[PDB]
Protein backbone atom coordinates (compact mmCIF):
# COMPACT_ATOMS: atom_id res chain seq x y z
CA UNK A 1 0.00 0.00 0.00
CA UNK A 2 2.61 2.43 0.79
CA UNK A 3 5.29 1.72 -1.77
CA UNK A 4 2.26 1.84 -4.63
CA UNK A 5 1.71 5.20 -3.26
CA UNK A 6 5.57 6.10 -3.12
CA UNK A 7 5.30 5.51 -6.34
CA UNK A 8 2.26 7.49 -7.33
CA UNK A 9 3.81 10.35 -5.89
CA UNK A 10 7.06 9.76 -7.11
CA UNK A 11 5.56 9.67 -10.99
CA UNK A 12 3.40 12.53 -9.57
CA UNK A 13 7.14 14.72 -8.73
CA UNK A 14 8.62 13.60 -11.68
CA UNK A 15 5.69 15.15 -14.03
CA UNK A 16 5.54 17.95 -12.27
CA UNK A 17 8.73 18.68 -12.48
CA UNK A 18 8.56 18.30 -16.36
CA UNK A 19 5.71 20.67 -16.25
CA UNK A 20 6.78 23.69 -14.47
CA UNK A 21 11.04 23.57 -16.01
CA UNK A 22 9.52 23.20 -18.82
CA UNK A 23 6.70 26.28 -18.44
CA UNK A 24 9.04 28.50 -16.72
CA UNK A 25 12.03 28.01 -18.79
CA UNK A 26 8.98 28.79 -21.89
CA UNK A 27 8.37 32.27 -19.67
CA UNK A 28 12.18 33.26 -19.25
CA UNK A 29 13.27 31.79 -23.31
CA UNK A 30 10.46 34.19 -24.57
CA UNK A 31 11.40 37.11 -22.61
CA UNK A 32 15.04 36.98 -23.25
CA UNK A 33 14.35 36.11 -26.53
CA UNK A 34 12.06 39.31 -27.22
CA UNK A 35 14.90 40.96 -25.37
CA UNK A 36 17.86 39.96 -27.36
CA UNK A 37 15.81 40.64 -31.13
CA UNK A 38 15.29 44.41 -30.11
CA UNK A 39 11.46 44.73 -29.09
CA UNK A 40 10.01 46.67 -26.19
CA UNK A 41 9.96 44.07 -22.72
CA UNK A 42 6.40 45.72 -20.93
CA UNK A 43 6.53 45.84 -16.72
CA UNK A 44 4.31 42.68 -16.86
CA UNK A 45 6.82 40.95 -18.66
CA UNK A 46 9.20 42.05 -16.00
CA UNK A 47 7.64 40.59 -13.72
CA UNK A 48 6.59 37.54 -15.16
CA UNK A 49 9.90 36.80 -16.03
CA UNK A 50 10.80 37.44 -12.30
CA UNK A 51 8.42 34.53 -11.19
CA UNK A 52 9.92 32.37 -14.06
CA UNK A 53 13.46 32.47 -12.93
CA UNK A 54 12.25 32.08 -8.91
CA UNK A 55 10.26 29.34 -10.36
CA UNK A 56 12.76 27.84 -11.83
CA UNK A 57 15.02 28.08 -8.79
CA UNK A 58 12.32 26.71 -6.45
CA UNK A 59 11.49 23.60 -8.23
CA UNK A 60 15.20 22.93 -8.90
CA UNK A 61 15.87 23.10 -5.21
CA UNK A 62 12.95 20.44 -4.64
CA UNK A 63 14.69 18.52 -7.21
CA UNK A 64 17.56 18.11 -6.18
CA UNK A 65 16.34 17.90 -2.41
CA UNK A 66 14.71 14.16 -3.89
CA UNK A 67 17.37 13.17 -5.76
CA UNK A 68 20.09 13.62 -2.59
CA UNK A 69 17.86 12.04 -0.52
CA UNK A 70 17.08 9.30 -2.25
CA UNK A 71 20.35 8.30 -3.87
CA UNK A 72 22.52 9.58 -0.46
CA UNK A 73 20.17 9.16 3.07
CA UNK A 74 23.18 9.38 4.93
CA UNK A 75 23.62 12.56 3.42
CA UNK A 76 20.24 13.32 3.98
CA UNK A 77 19.95 12.62 7.38
CA UNK A 78 22.76 15.43 8.37
CA UNK A 79 21.45 18.35 10.51
CA UNK A 80 23.58 21.10 8.24
CA UNK A 81 21.59 19.97 4.60
CA UNK A 82 18.51 19.81 6.02
CA UNK A 83 18.66 23.61 7.79
CA UNK A 84 20.27 24.72 4.81
CA UNK A 85 17.28 23.33 2.63
CA UNK A 86 15.00 24.38 4.77
CA UNK A 87 16.12 28.10 4.95
CA UNK A 88 17.66 28.02 1.35
CA UNK A 89 13.35 26.87 0.67
CA UNK A 90 11.83 29.62 2.79
CA UNK A 91 13.64 32.24 1.18
CA UNK A 92 13.41 31.30 -2.04
CA UNK A 93 9.78 30.62 -2.04
CA UNK A 94 8.72 33.62 0.19
CA UNK A 95 10.50 35.59 -2.98
CA UNK A 96 8.27 33.78 -5.35
CA UNK A 97 4.80 34.06 -3.48
CA UNK A 98 5.32 37.62 -2.72
CA UNK A 99 6.12 38.33 -6.74
CA UNK A 100 2.82 36.36 -7.76
CA UNK A 101 1.06 38.35 -5.41
CA UNK A 102 3.11 41.43 -6.48
CA UNK A 103 2.06 40.35 -10.08
CA UNK A 104 -1.48 40.51 -8.81
CA UNK A 105 -1.30 44.12 -7.04
CA UNK A 106 0.05 44.94 -10.35
CA UNK A 107 -3.25 43.14 -12.18
CA UNK A 108 -5.50 45.25 -9.60
CA UNK A 109 -4.27 48.81 -9.72
CA UNK A 110 -3.87 48.65 -13.19
CA UNK A 111 -7.31 47.64 -14.21
CA UNK A 112 -10.10 47.95 -11.01
CA UNK A 113 -11.95 51.24 -11.06
CA UNK A 114 -13.25 52.50 -7.94
CA UNK A 115 -13.93 56.06 -6.50
CA UNK A 116 -12.15 56.08 -3.02
CA UNK A 117 -9.21 58.19 -2.64
CA UNK A 118 -6.68 55.81 -1.17
CA UNK A 119 -6.98 53.53 -4.07
CA UNK A 120 -6.93 56.00 -6.50
CA UNK A 121 -3.33 57.39 -4.57
CA UNK A 122 -2.14 53.63 -4.96
CA UNK A 123 -3.30 53.28 -8.48
CA UNK A 124 -1.01 56.25 -9.67
CA UNK A 125 1.63 54.44 -7.97
CA UNK A 126 2.01 51.40 -8.94
CA UNK A 127 5.47 50.39 -9.34
CA UNK A 128 5.78 52.55 -6.01
CA UNK A 129 3.64 50.05 -4.38
CA UNK A 130 4.65 46.72 -5.52
CA UNK A 131 8.19 47.87 -4.44
CA UNK A 132 6.91 49.08 -0.92
CA UNK A 133 4.89 45.49 -0.66
CA UNK A 134 7.74 43.42 -1.89
CA UNK A 135 10.19 45.64 0.86
CA UNK A 136 7.90 45.69 3.71
CA UNK A 137 6.72 42.19 3.44
CA UNK A 138 10.43 41.15 4.26
CA UNK A 139 9.30 41.57 8.48
CA UNK A 140 7.22 38.24 6.95
CA UNK A 141 10.46 35.91 6.27
CA UNK A 142 12.61 37.45 8.89
CA UNK A 143 9.51 36.42 11.15
CA UNK A 144 9.14 32.90 9.65
CA UNK A 145 13.05 32.50 9.25
CA UNK A 146 13.39 33.24 13.29
CA UNK A 147 9.92 30.88 14.21
CA UNK A 148 11.23 27.95 11.54
CA UNK A 149 14.52 28.23 13.14
CA UNK A 150 13.12 27.66 17.00
CA UNK A 151 10.97 24.89 15.57
CA UNK A 152 14.29 23.73 14.14
CA UNK A 153 16.31 24.00 17.77
CA UNK A 154 13.41 22.53 19.45
CA UNK A 155 13.48 19.48 17.46
CA UNK A 156 17.01 18.85 17.82
CA UNK A 157 17.18 19.29 21.42
CA UNK A 158 13.80 17.45 22.31
CA UNK A 159 12.47 17.10 12.24
CA UNK A 160 9.31 18.14 13.61
CA UNK A 161 8.05 18.29 10.46
CA UNK A 162 4.19 18.31 11.45
CA UNK A 163 4.99 21.92 12.93
CA UNK A 164 7.45 23.32 10.33
CA UNK A 165 5.05 21.96 7.10
CA UNK A 166 2.30 23.52 9.68
CA UNK A 167 4.49 26.88 9.73
CA UNK A 168 5.27 27.03 6.56
CA UNK A 169 1.78 26.56 5.06
CA UNK A 170 0.59 29.03 7.53
CA UNK A 171 2.89 32.05 5.81
CA UNK A 172 1.75 30.85 2.45
CA UNK A 173 -1.64 31.47 2.76
CA UNK A 174 -1.47 35.02 3.77
CA UNK A 175 0.01 35.88 0.09
CA UNK A 176 -2.79 33.46 -1.55
CA UNK A 177 -5.77 35.28 0.88
CA UNK A 178 -4.24 38.86 -0.75
CA UNK A 179 -4.33 37.79 -4.20
CA UNK A 180 -7.77 36.12 -3.67
CA UNK A 181 -9.24 39.27 -2.36
CA UNK A 182 -7.63 41.55 -5.17
CA UNK A 183 -8.96 39.04 -7.63
CA UNK A 184 -12.60 39.45 -6.17
CA UNK A 185 -12.41 43.15 -5.85
CA UNK A 186 -11.20 42.82 -9.54
CA UNK A 187 -14.43 40.86 -10.89
CA UNK A 188 -16.48 43.08 -8.41
CA UNK A 189 -15.31 45.95 -10.20
CA UNK A 190 -15.96 44.40 -14.14
CA UNK A 191 -19.24 43.25 -12.97
CA UNK A 192 -20.73 47.16 -11.55
CA UNK A 193 -19.04 48.54 -14.84
CA UNK A 194 -20.90 45.80 -16.87
CA UNK A 195 -24.09 46.73 -14.77
CA UNK A 196 -23.44 50.37 -15.63
CA UNK A 197 -22.57 49.99 -19.26
CA UNK A 198 -25.66 47.48 -19.82
CA UNK A 199 -28.44 50.11 -18.81
CA UNK A 200 -27.05 53.85 -19.36
CA UNK A 201 -25.02 52.45 -22.82
CA UNK A 202 -26.56 50.49 -25.28
CA UNK A 203 -23.79 47.87 -24.66
CA UNK A 204 -21.58 48.27 -28.33
CA UNK A 205 -22.75 47.70 -31.81
CA UNK A 206 -19.69 46.01 -32.48
CA UNK A 207 -19.92 43.52 -29.15
CA UNK A 208 -16.36 42.18 -30.31
CA UNK A 209 -13.60 43.19 -27.67
CA UNK A 210 -14.21 43.72 -24.26
CA UNK A 211 -14.06 41.04 -21.47
CA UNK A 212 -15.10 38.55 -23.75
CA UNK A 213 -11.38 37.74 -24.30
CA UNK A 214 -10.95 38.02 -20.80
CA UNK A 215 -13.32 35.52 -19.56
CA UNK A 216 -11.05 32.46 -20.89
CA UNK A 217 -8.44 33.92 -18.26
CA UNK A 218 -10.68 34.39 -15.25
CA UNK A 219 -12.13 30.98 -15.70
CA UNK A 220 -8.76 29.31 -16.23
CA UNK A 221 -7.98 31.44 -12.98
CA UNK A 222 -10.84 30.58 -10.76
CA UNK A 223 -10.40 27.21 -11.80
CA UNK A 224 -6.97 26.94 -10.39
CA UNK A 225 -7.76 29.08 -7.50
CA UNK A 226 -10.49 25.90 -6.26
CA UNK A 227 -8.09 23.32 -7.30
CA UNK A 228 -5.34 24.97 -5.43
CA UNK A 229 -7.72 25.70 -2.07
CA UNK A 230 -8.92 22.22 -2.22
CA UNK A 231 -5.29 20.85 -2.22
CA UNK A 232 -4.44 23.19 0.84
CA UNK A 233 -7.36 21.66 2.55
CA UNK A 234 -6.23 18.14 1.62
CA UNK A 235 -2.61 18.33 2.53
CA UNK A 236 -2.90 20.40 5.87
CA UNK A 237 -5.82 17.61 7.04
CA UNK A 238 -3.50 14.98 5.94
CA UNK A 239 -0.33 16.54 7.55
CA UNK A 240 -2.11 16.60 10.99
CA UNK A 241 -4.09 13.72 10.93
CA UNK A 242 -1.56 10.43 10.75
CA UNK A 243 0.79 10.57 7.75
CA UNK A 244 4.24 9.09 8.48
CA UNK A 245 5.17 9.65 4.64
CA UNK A 246 5.25 13.29 4.67
CA UNK A 247 8.58 14.21 2.82
CA UNK A 248 7.73 13.20 -0.62
CA UNK A 249 4.17 14.27 -0.65
CA UNK A 250 5.34 17.51 0.98
CA UNK A 251 7.87 17.57 -1.94
CA UNK A 252 4.91 17.44 -4.25
CA UNK A 253 2.69 19.68 -2.59
CA UNK A 254 5.61 22.64 -2.89
CA UNK A 255 6.26 21.60 -6.50
CA UNK A 256 2.49 22.14 -7.26
CA UNK A 257 2.15 26.20 -6.98
CA UNK A 258 5.29 26.95 -9.53
CA UNK A 259 4.51 24.27 -12.00
CA UNK A 260 0.90 24.90 -12.55
CA UNK A 261 0.86 28.81 -12.20
CA UNK A 262 2.76 28.79 -14.61
CA UNK A 263 1.16 27.21 -17.19
CA UNK A 264 -1.98 28.89 -15.87
CA UNK A 265 -0.33 32.31 -16.51
CA UNK A 266 0.63 30.86 -20.42
CA UNK A 267 -2.79 30.81 -20.71
CA UNK A 268 -3.27 34.35 -20.34
CA UNK A 269 -1.03 36.70 -21.93
CA UNK A 270 -1.09 37.67 -25.38
CA UNK A 271 2.75 37.05 -25.46
CA UNK A 272 2.82 34.09 -24.54
CA UNK A 273 -0.27 32.61 -26.39
CA UNK A 274 1.39 34.29 -29.32
CA UNK A 275 4.58 32.41 -28.51
CA UNK A 276 2.88 28.79 -27.96
CA UNK A 277 1.01 29.09 -31.05
CA UNK A 278 4.25 29.87 -33.34
CA UNK A 279 5.87 26.72 -31.62
CA UNK A 280 2.97 24.47 -32.06
CA UNK A 281 3.09 26.39 -35.95
CA UNK A 282 6.61 25.81 -36.86
CA UNK A 283 7.35 22.39 -34.88
CA UNK A 284 4.86 21.31 -37.45
C1 LIG B 1 1.20 25.16 1.17
C2 LIG B 1 1.52 23.70 1.44
C3 LIG B 1 0.35 22.82 1.06
C4 LIG B 1 2.80 23.28 0.72
C5 LIG B 1 4.06 23.96 1.18
C6 LIG B 1 5.30 23.16 0.91
C7 LIG B 1 6.20 22.92 2.13
C8 LIG B 1 5.36 22.60 3.36
C9 LIG B 1 7.23 21.82 1.81
C10 LIG B 1 7.77 21.94 0.36
C11 LIG B 1 9.20 21.35 0.36
C12 LIG B 1 9.36 20.77 1.76
C13 LIG B 1 10.75 20.46 2.28
C14 LIG B 1 11.49 19.51 1.34
C15 LIG B 1 12.62 18.79 1.98
C16 LIG B 1 12.85 18.73 3.28
C17 LIG B 1 13.94 17.85 3.85
C18 LIG B 1 13.43 16.83 4.85
O1 LIG B 1 14.29 16.79 6.00
C19 LIG B 1 12.02 17.16 5.28
C20 LIG B 1 11.85 18.65 5.55
C21 LIG B 1 12.04 19.53 4.29
C22 LIG B 1 12.81 20.81 4.65
C23 LIG B 1 10.64 19.84 3.68
C24 LIG B 1 9.74 20.65 4.62
C25 LIG B 1 8.37 20.97 4.01
C26 LIG B 1 8.52 21.69 2.66
C27 LIG B 1 9.17 23.07 2.86
C1 LIG C 1 -4.48 35.33 -15.92
C2 LIG C 1 -5.22 36.41 -15.15
C3 LIG C 1 -6.27 37.11 -15.72
C4 LIG C 1 -6.91 38.07 -14.97
C5 LIG C 1 -8.04 38.87 -15.56
F1 LIG C 1 -8.98 38.04 -16.11
F2 LIG C 1 -8.59 39.63 -14.58
F3 LIG C 1 -7.49 39.67 -16.52
N1 LIG C 1 -6.51 38.31 -13.75
C6 LIG C 1 -5.52 37.63 -13.24
N2 LIG C 1 -5.01 37.84 -11.91
C7 LIG C 1 -5.38 38.74 -10.85
C8 LIG C 1 -6.38 39.68 -10.91
C9 LIG C 1 -6.63 40.46 -9.81
C10 LIG C 1 -5.88 40.31 -8.66
C11 LIG C 1 -4.90 39.37 -8.61
C12 LIG C 1 -4.65 38.59 -9.71
C13 LIG C 1 -3.52 37.56 -9.69
N3 LIG C 1 -3.35 36.55 -8.83
N4 LIG C 1 -2.22 35.89 -9.12
N5 LIG C 1 -1.67 36.47 -10.15
N6 LIG C 1 -2.43 37.51 -10.52
N7 LIG C 1 -4.88 36.70 -13.92
Given at each position: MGGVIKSIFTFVLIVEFIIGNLGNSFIALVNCIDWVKGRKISSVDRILTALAISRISLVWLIFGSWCVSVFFPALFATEKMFRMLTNIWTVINHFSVWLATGLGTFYFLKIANFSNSIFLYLKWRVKKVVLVLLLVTSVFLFLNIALINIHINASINGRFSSLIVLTSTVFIFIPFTLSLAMFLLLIFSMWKHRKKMQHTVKISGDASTKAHRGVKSVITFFLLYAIFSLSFFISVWTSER????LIILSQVMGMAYPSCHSCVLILGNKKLRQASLSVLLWLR
Open positions: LEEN
